[PDB]
Amino acid sequence: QQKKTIAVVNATGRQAASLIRVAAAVGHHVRAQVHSLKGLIAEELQAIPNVTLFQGPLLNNVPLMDTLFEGAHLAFINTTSQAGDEIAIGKDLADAAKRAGTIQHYIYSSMPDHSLYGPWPAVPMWAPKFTVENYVRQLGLPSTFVYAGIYNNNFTSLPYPLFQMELMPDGTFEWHAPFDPDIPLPWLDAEHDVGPALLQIFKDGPQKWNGHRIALTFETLSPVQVCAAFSRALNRRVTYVQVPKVEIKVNIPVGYREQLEAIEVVFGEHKAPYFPLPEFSRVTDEARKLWSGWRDMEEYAREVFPIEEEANGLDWML
């Protein structure tokens, strides 16, 4: 019934930002943690009426944590590797929340530890989340865990790793990745659908979702289909090319390099499932039930892709 106060971290991130916009819009209060006020998103969120930001780091920063949870009834926690030890952080947060004693529903955004379901390696920026999940369960916090599918908007024609929808000279598009071209992958439209879904989960309470793992994915497509989709929207020739290794056309920091290396092995070498969890091995059923106004690849490719490019400074849409 009544709207609550939600604590969120990494406010500028695609998952948080999505929730924040929708949460504030319907009447909820938002206490959010941002690493910096400088930035488009930052200023945007800074602008939304019932949003209160706290600028500071999460690593070894319990003071902020305590503040953030003051008067909070809900929480959507989704960290990044850019902030430091994601487990020391994810643990402190969960401790903060418990100390607050007012959290009714604590949704943590989790990811698989592939080395636990096969002879595979632990993907560097996913596996640590799984450890924090268990810790949340351990504290007994009324929680629900979400596993986000890969973002439709990771795509860009720019020289960024793994998800480059490259604009060939002849005006065609090509996507080169280690992923099998025939194997469906779990997709998700972060900006468009994370907010609405998390809202609906909160709207349901731990009475329904406590202890549950939910796959935040609204559609499954194989690389070839992804391309068939971009090709459907832009009315151009988009073709997929399976490459043994991830192409790194620019300078990237270690963590992302190691991350990609693991990805090469797990998806390229071992042809493994994005969600190696027995429960996630349709996976889109629950997600679609929670939010049925999701945005598929076709609409993304057509309606958003072009725009995002444009903003990034490109011009083939003109």
Binding site: A17, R21, V22, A25, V26, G195, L199, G293
Partner: protein
């Protein structure tokens, strides 16, 4: 048609706000469930 909120032109099902005005599945659904117009980035 085009959505009056997000202005998309790609949607699985078209909707009508309390004014018969054209909304997309998302915008229309969000409004219906929460009471306010779907908030858009930017």
């Amino acid at each position: 048609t085009t959505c009056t909120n997000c202005f998309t032109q790609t949607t699985p099902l078209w909707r009508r706000n309390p004014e018969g005005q054209p909304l997309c599945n998302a915008c229309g659904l969000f409004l219906k469930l929460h009471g306010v117009v779907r908030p858009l980035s930017l």
